[PDB]
């Protein structure tokens, strides 16, 4: 699975993590098994307009 | 053997923070086994907790949960609580109260009968 988020947001998107984007976008169960890769990419998904 | 585990209790806790888990137990066994947690780290692998013996003679606690766990068990009702002591903000996980059916735990690999699991997590 894909997704991009914020950096303020690294901590937010967490097995057992709440807010807007823990709760309301992207859910980990407690026992989850595999990884998550977060890389920034400023370059490309975020316009200098 | 067949053996049926009531096991109750729970909630939120918070960073030093304390449970009063419970474990009633109930059915036949092969051996009067030794009731306790059999809890793993959210993600982790199943870890043994805290033992508490049926005659309430034998007690066990690990590196990772001393300081801030303790078993016992009721002498009424025969319900096993885990009595708390400043719980840190790194126990959300899930605890489940396996039964050990043989009178000494040589090793706590082997599990005879599982029980219940207890999902409580630590924040404010």
């Not at chain 2, 007690?59 to 009424?76: E, L, P, Q, W």
Request: charged letters at 20%; hydrophobic letters at 35%.
């Amino acid at each position: 699975d894909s997704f991009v988020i914020r950096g303020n947001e690294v901590s937010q998107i967490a097995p057992g993590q709440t807010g807007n984007i823990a709760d309301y976008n992207y859910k980990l169960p407690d026992d989850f098994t595999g990884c998550v890769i977060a890389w920034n990419s400023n370059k490309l998904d975020s316009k200098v307009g | 053997s067949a053996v049926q585990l009531q096991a109750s209790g729970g909630g939120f806790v918070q960073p030093g923070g304390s449970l009063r888990l419970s474990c009633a137990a109930s059915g036949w066994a092969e051996t009067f086994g030794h009731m306790g947690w059999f809890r793993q780290a959210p993600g982790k692998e199943r870890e043994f907790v805290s033992a508490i013996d049926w005659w309430d003679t034998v007690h066990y606690y690990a590196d990772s949960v001393k300081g801030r766990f303790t078993i016992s068990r009721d002498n009424s009702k025969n319900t096993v609580y885990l009595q708390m002591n400043s719980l840190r903000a790194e126990d959300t996980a899930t605890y489940y109260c396996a039964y050990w059916d043989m009178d000494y735990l040589q090793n706590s690999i082997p599990v005879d009968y599982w029980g219940q699991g207890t999902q409580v997590t630590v924040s404010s």
